[PDB]
Structure 1
Amino acid sequence: SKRYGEKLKEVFLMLDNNVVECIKEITESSRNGKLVFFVGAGVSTLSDYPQWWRLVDKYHEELYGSPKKGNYSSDEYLRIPQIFYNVKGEMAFDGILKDFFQVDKPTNPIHDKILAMNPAHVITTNYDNLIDTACWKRGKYFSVISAEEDVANATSSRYLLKVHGDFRKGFKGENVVLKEDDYLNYDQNYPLISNLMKTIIATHTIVFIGYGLGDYNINMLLNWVRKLQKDSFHKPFFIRTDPSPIENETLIYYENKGLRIIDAASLIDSNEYDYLERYSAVMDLLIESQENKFITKDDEVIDYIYGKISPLFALQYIRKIDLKHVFEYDYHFEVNGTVVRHKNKGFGYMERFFELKESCDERSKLSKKQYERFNALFNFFEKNGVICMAKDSIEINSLAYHGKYDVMKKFIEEQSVSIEDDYKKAFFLACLGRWEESYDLYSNIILNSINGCVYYLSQINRYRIYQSITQAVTQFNYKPFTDEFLARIEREMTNFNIDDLFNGMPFEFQKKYKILEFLSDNQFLYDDTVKLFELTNKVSSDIVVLLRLYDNLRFLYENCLWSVSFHEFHQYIRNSMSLLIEKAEYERTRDIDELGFGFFMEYYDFVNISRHFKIDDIKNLERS
């Protein structure tokens, strides 16, 4: 196991530059969710599924009473079943298919690797259910499309597209593409499936696995690709697992045809019959490239952390709990600024980054561009209060939080020099009650903002301020807002679904700014409200709760989000502060009981209590 990992790392370090670039593109596409796997028959044979040549042999035996002397050609594989279908009855064909294919076979680890690569869709020429079984086990639901009618009623947005059909309806030759007749009339009999396959191939990054370079489907797809306009499509990737290394002439010939070939035999040395070894070699190379197990040098951890962090440079402050989602739970980011390795199995890039931060000599060894990127990363991390790993005071910079109303008015009066200044102006106007002007400014920003994170935040804030205006109008019934303005906002906000706002953003934004998705949710503080129960235990929790409250407040104020003014956030602040004070009082009473002679509140605590607590809530706090 460990020897296999060391061998894989050695192979990657000696990998060709072209194969390295192909692996990088495949991993990037998988991260973006644009990856699709075209699964061939080799993956099925890896699970000992009955190969088609066995069926051809059975049909030949039934036709002539003896297996053919020699080897079938490519045309015979489709002709002999056709001859059996014609001269013999269709019932015999279907019965032989049932006798040969109604078997139960386990799913090979290659299916698990393909699924762990996170493909958007899976296109397969296999008529078996092995990939269906693997997807069913792994919990990723795929809309299995194997007939013409399945295309119209597709349940989900991700497809298990069996372009050659399967035996779900039954072990009948009419449901699959086996005979030469089926291949001849495939376009006529499967228009929708072929169109869907071509659309998926055009709109996604295709990786071919389980196919030979001389396969019928591969050549047909290359012929169709030949019809496309030059450079109007992405060249599909082809994983070649044949025992012998691919010839250079064949390699260049097929690369000119549009296939970027990663050849398993060229990467590692394996036995002639060890197909699973080569399949696992390629798939594991891709997976450990995804898992960052091949990052072995500095100025490369810098690139990865920069790719993860640089989109967040637009945002003023990032919650520590958001950094967990930024790195996909690779590290736990404690509120006190300490980082802990949590779930990453590859290189410890955060530890290397902190080592670079601590010692200047190792930092100097980086490249110039990587040195500047590290400088930006260090500024970002120190600004967000990330210091070092576990083994090694709140401050909110927002005029709205401190109630500097005159300064907010002054900032509003000046002329904005950037879109971010307009965003801050709109938030300040919202905090000052000028909600009509806030809505107009947010609409203007939305118009002029198409990273596009300011656009998303402006849409969120505009919906929030529209809800605030609606609730104020409902509770008032004075006319602070003209009826024309109310009608205009109603006509603008009708059928406006905030739930689909994030999904309508570009997928590059949806990958770079996953941590903002919670802003479109109706409720986003359920987690902290739930962990507030630890303060009710009667048997540190208080400091982490207070620091998380400070993190939420700083994120909502520094980034200028109107959701800070809603009832849910006020309720969360009230509950957290009340529970903290009650727990401190309980600790004081327990100590005075056991000893016989707690909470230290600061300016920020006073501001939070003043802004979020009602008079009744403060009365309850004093009474209890």
Structure 2
Amino acid sequence: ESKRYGEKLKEVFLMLDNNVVECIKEITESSRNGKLVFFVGAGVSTLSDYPQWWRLVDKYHEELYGSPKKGNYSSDEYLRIPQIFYNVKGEMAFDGILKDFFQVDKPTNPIHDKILAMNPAHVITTNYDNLIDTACWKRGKYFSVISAEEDVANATSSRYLLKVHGDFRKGFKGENVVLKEDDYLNYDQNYPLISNLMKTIIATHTIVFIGYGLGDYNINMLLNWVRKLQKDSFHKPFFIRTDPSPIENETLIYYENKGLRIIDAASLIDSNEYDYLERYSAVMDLLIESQENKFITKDDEVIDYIYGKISPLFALQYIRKIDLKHVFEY
């Protein structure tokens, strides 16, 4: 794996489509400009084998109905089956089922480290893991965690780590998170400040999605607001598609006309079906290697780099050799 990954990435990059090349260029420029904002979903947490929603709804069906749901179990039941439980068994049973799985000490996946290596201004986050932020503090980066409405006005730094659907920091109660059918319906009325903060960071930062799927509820709720906003008033968000099967061109056209920009991980690498870790790692490593310039081969690229990092100083009669080391990131 020593020379395997470097050569594999080199081969992948020099064959990429120009659209993906422009996407990588823009993402790297935003990252080095203190403007990138990440959007990690449920997918990134499952890379550490975190308890997924489907197992929880399966147990909720088993307890409430006496048996797990037969056949397919993706028919909007993800929001309904828990809700009935909350409206039948009450509060204590909901809390117990919640704490049974979500109280687990899990190690952090390296994908989180690669994400935080991009130096993002804010990280708008949806999952419930208490280990997404733990990967943030084990490095030298402080992120003010905002999970409820009371934490919006008490933020200290200008960098926010936003738990839009809440988290279990203030205990494992079933009221501090957005899980049942009612919370998803009343999200705009129970968390108005968090919604406004979300739309604020989205409008004034480059947005990169990760860990989501084309058709998730949150992506749709963001896209309808995007379509409602205006014409050419938002920077188009970047989407990291990581599904195993390659994306058909028609869906790509539809979603990139709906106000999205898709980076499909299954096309540029011909990996196996269930290889999610490498599928994320390919795109994340392309971004990281483009940050630190492990992709330059032609002399023109070298000189364009030097000129892009030195041109602003052409307006200065002279510059000390000592602080020139700060120009080229040490």
Q: Please give the TM-score of this superposition, normalised by the length of structure 2.
A: 0.98
Distance in 2 (alpha carbons) for counterparts of 1:270 and 1:182 = 38
The 2-side partners of 1:130 and 1:18 are apart by: 34
Where 1:37 maps in the other structure, the secondary structure is: strand
Three-state SS of the structure 2 residue aligned to 1:299 is helix
SS of the equivalent of 2:300 reads: coil
Asked if residue 254 in structure 1 is aligned to residue 282 in structure 2, the reply is no
- What CA deviation, in whole Å up to 9, does each residue of 1:419-440 have, x standing for no partner? xxxxxxxxxxxxxxxxxxxxxx
Q: C-alpha displacement at 1:76, in angstroms?
A: 0.4
Question: Which secondary structure does the structure 2 equivalent of 1:170 belong to?
Answer: coil
Deviations 1:333-366 (A, max 9, x none): xxxxxxxxxxxxxxxxxxxxxxxxxxxxxxxxxx
Uncovered stretches (5+) of structure 1, i.e. residues with no partner: 327-622
Q: Taking structure 1 as reference, are residues 40 and 74 closer, same or farther at Cα in structure 2, changes over 3 Å only?
A: farther
Report percent identity of matched pairs. Answer: 99
Q: CA deviation at 1:252?
A: 0.6
Counterpart-to-counterpart distance in 2, 1:17 and 1:58:
47
SS at match of 1:81: helix
Q: CA deviation at 1:188?
A: 0.3
Cα separation, 1, equivalents of 2:70 and 2:22? 46
Distance 1:289 1:142 in 2: 25
* CA–CA distance in structure 2, aligned partners of residues 74 and 203 of structure 1: 35
**Rounded Cα–Cα distance in structure 1 between residues aligned with 2:75 and 2:165:** 18
1:323 to partner: Cα distance:
0.8
- Pick 1 or 2: higher relative contact order, CA cutoff 8 A, min separation 6: 2
Deviations 1:171-205 (A, max 9, x none): 11111111110100000000000100110000000
**1-side partners of 2:276 and 2:100: how far apart?**
27
- How far apart, in 2, do the equivalents of 1:219 and 1:299 lie? 42
Report the Cα offset of residue 35 of structure 1.
Answer: 0.1
Q: For 1:319 and 1:156, how far apart are their aligned partners in 2?
A: 33
Offset from partner CA, 1:204-234 (integer Å, 9 cap, x none): 0000000001111001000000111111110
Q: Following the alignment from structure 2 to structure 1, what is the Cα–Cα distance between the partners of residues 129 and 97?
A: 16
Count of aligned positions: 328
Note the alpha carbon deviations across 1:554-602, whole angstroms, 9 max, x for none.
xxxxxxxxxxxxxxxxxxxxxxxxxxxxxxxxxxxxxxxxxxxxxxxxx
Q: Deviations over 1:144-170 (max 9, x none)?
A: 000010001101110000101000001
1:110-141 Cα offsets, whole Å, 9 max, x none, are 10000001110000111111221010101200
**For residue 157 of structure 2, what is the aligned residue in structure 1?**
156
Distance 2:207 2:246 in 1: 22
The residue matched to 1:36 in structure 2 has which SS?
A: strand
Shift of 1:9: 0.7
Q: 1:67 to 1:13 in 2, by over 3 A?
A: same
Spell out the pairing of 1:181-220 with structure 2 (5 A cutoff). 181-220=182-221
- Distance of 1:178 and 1:61 partners within structure 2: 18
Q: Report deviation, 1:271.
A: 1.5
2:32 aligned counterpart, secondary structure: helix
Structure with higher Rg: it is 1
Inter-partner Cα distance in structure 2 for 1:286 and 1:143? 25
Counterpart of 1:48 in structure 2 is 49
Deviations along 1:55-83, one digit per CA (max 9) or x if unpaired, are 00010000111111112224100000101
Alignment partners' CA distance in 1, 2:296 and 2:174: 49
Separation (CA, whole Å) in 2 of partners of 1:63 and 1:114: 39
Counterparts of 2:254 and 2:154, CA distance in 1? 40
| Deviation string, structure 1 residues 369-398 (Cα, Å, up to 9, x no partner) | xxxxxxxxxxxxxxxxxxxxxxxxxxxxxx
Distance 2:315 2:40 in 1: 41
* 1:3-42: CA deviation from partner (whole Å, max 9, x where unpaired): 1110001000000000000000000000101000000111
| 2-structure distance, mates of 1:74, 1:315 | 64
Q: Distance in 1 between matches of 2:51 and 2:316?
A: 56
- Counterparts of 2:105 and 2:283, CA distance in 1: 27
3-state SS of paired residue (1:300): helix
Aligned counterparts, 1:131-280, within 5 A: 131-280=132-281
Tell me the distance in 2 between the aligned counterparts of 1:321 and 1:219. 51
CA distance in 1, matches of 2:114, 2:174: 31
| SS of residue matched to 1:307 | helix
Task: Give, in angstroms, the shift of residue 277 of structure 1.
Answer: 0.7
2 CA distance for matches of 1:288 and 1:74? 41
Q: How far apart are the structure 1 equivalents of 2:228 and 2:197? A: 17
Rounded to whole Å, the distance in 2 between the matches of 1:42 and 1:216 is 14
Aligned partners of 2:198, 2:6: CA distance in 1, in Å? Answer: 36
Deviations 1:430-456 (A, max 9, x none): xxxxxxxxxxxxxxxxxxxxxxxxxxx
For 1:46 and 1:69, the matched residues in 2 are separated by 27
Pairwise CA distance, 1:2? 1.5
Q: CA deviation at 1:281?
A: 0.5
1:302 alignment partner in structure 2 = 303
> For the residues of structure 1 that align with 2:129 and 2:146, how far apart are their CA atoms?
13
In 1, Cα distance between the equivalents of 2:314 and 2:118? 29
Distance 1:28 1:149 in 2: 34
Give the whole-Å Cα distance in 1 for the aligned partners of 2:297 and 2:173.
Answer: 53
**1:227-280 Cα shifts (integer Å, max 9, x gaps):** 111111100000010001111000010000111100000110111111001000
**1:262-304 deviation line (CA, Å, top 9, x unaligned):** 0000110111111001000010010001110001111111111
Unpaired stretches in structure 2, ≥5 consecutive residues: none
Q: Secondary structure at the match of 2:322?
A: helix
**Structure 1 CA distance, aligned partners of 2:132 and 2:24?**
23
Q: Secondary structure at the match of 1:138?
A: coil
| SS of structure 2 residue aligned to 1:262 | strand
Runs of at least 4 residues of structure 1 off by over 3 A? none
Task: Specify the SS of the correspondent of 2:295.
Answer: coil
TM-superposed CA distance for 1:87, in Å, is 1.1
The normalised TM-score by structure 1 is 0.52
How far does the alpha carbon of each residue in 1:487-522 deviate from its partner, in whole angstroms, 9 at most, with x for none?
Answer: xxxxxxxxxxxxxxxxxxxxxxxxxxxxxxxxxxxx
- The answer for the alignment partner of 1:602 in structure 2 is none
Q: For 2:241 and 2:309, how far apart are their aligned partners in 1?
A: 32
- How many Å separate the matches in 1 of 2:73 and 2:152? 35
User: The residue matched to 1:130 in structure 2 has which SS?
Assistant: coil
> Which residue number corresponds to residue 107 of structure 1?
108
CA distance in 2 between counterparts of 1:2 and 1:84 reads: 53
Distance 1:267 1:104 in 2: 35
